[PDB]
C-alpha cells in the first residue's frame, strides 16, 4: 500500500501537503521506516528528502514532539 502510487501523485513539493508529511513523522521526531509508512522505496526516499528540507527550514522539530 503506497498511497502515492495508488493515487498517482507523481510529484512532491514542500509547501503543498505538509500534513501528509507530519503523518509520516514519528511522535518522537524521527522518520518512520517502510514497515510503518508502507510507501515504495522511491516515494519514501522523496518523503525523507522533503522532511529533511523541512527540518532545515524550521518546519518540523528535531528531538521532541
Amino acid at each position: 500500500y503506497c498511497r502515492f502510487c495508488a493515487i498517482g501523485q507523481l510529484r512532491i513539493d514542500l509547501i503543498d501537503d505538509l500534513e501528509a508529511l507530519k503523518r509520516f513523522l514519528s511522535p518522537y521526531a524521527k522518520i518512520n521506516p517502510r514497515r510503518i509508512t508502507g510507501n515504495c522505496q522511491m516515494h519514501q526516499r522523496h518523503v525523507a528528502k522533503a522532511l529533511k528540507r523541512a527540518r532545515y527550514l524550521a518546519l518540523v522539530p528535531f528531538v521532541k514532539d
Partner: protein, 53 residues
C-alpha cells in the same frame, strides 16, 4: 518521549522505548571501523528479516 496518563499503561511502552533507546545508544559510545559499522548493520537487518520476517 512524553506519554503517561494515570499509573502503568504508559510504562510498558516506556520499557519498549527504553530498550530501543539503549539499542541506539550502545553503538555510539565505543569506536571501531566503518566497515564494522556497515557489516554489523547488515547483520542486524538480516536478523530482523529472518526472525520478524
Amino acid at each position: 518521549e512524553v506519554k503517561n496518563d494515570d499509573l502503568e499503561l504508559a510504562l510498558k511502552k516506556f520499557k519498549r522505548v527504553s530498550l530501543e533507546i539503549r539499542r541506539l545508544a550502545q553503538r555510539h559510545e565505543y569506536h571501531l571501523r566503518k566497515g564494522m559499522r556497515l557489516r554489523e548493520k547488515r547483520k542486524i537487518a538480516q536478523k530482523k528479516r529472518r526472525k520478524f520476517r
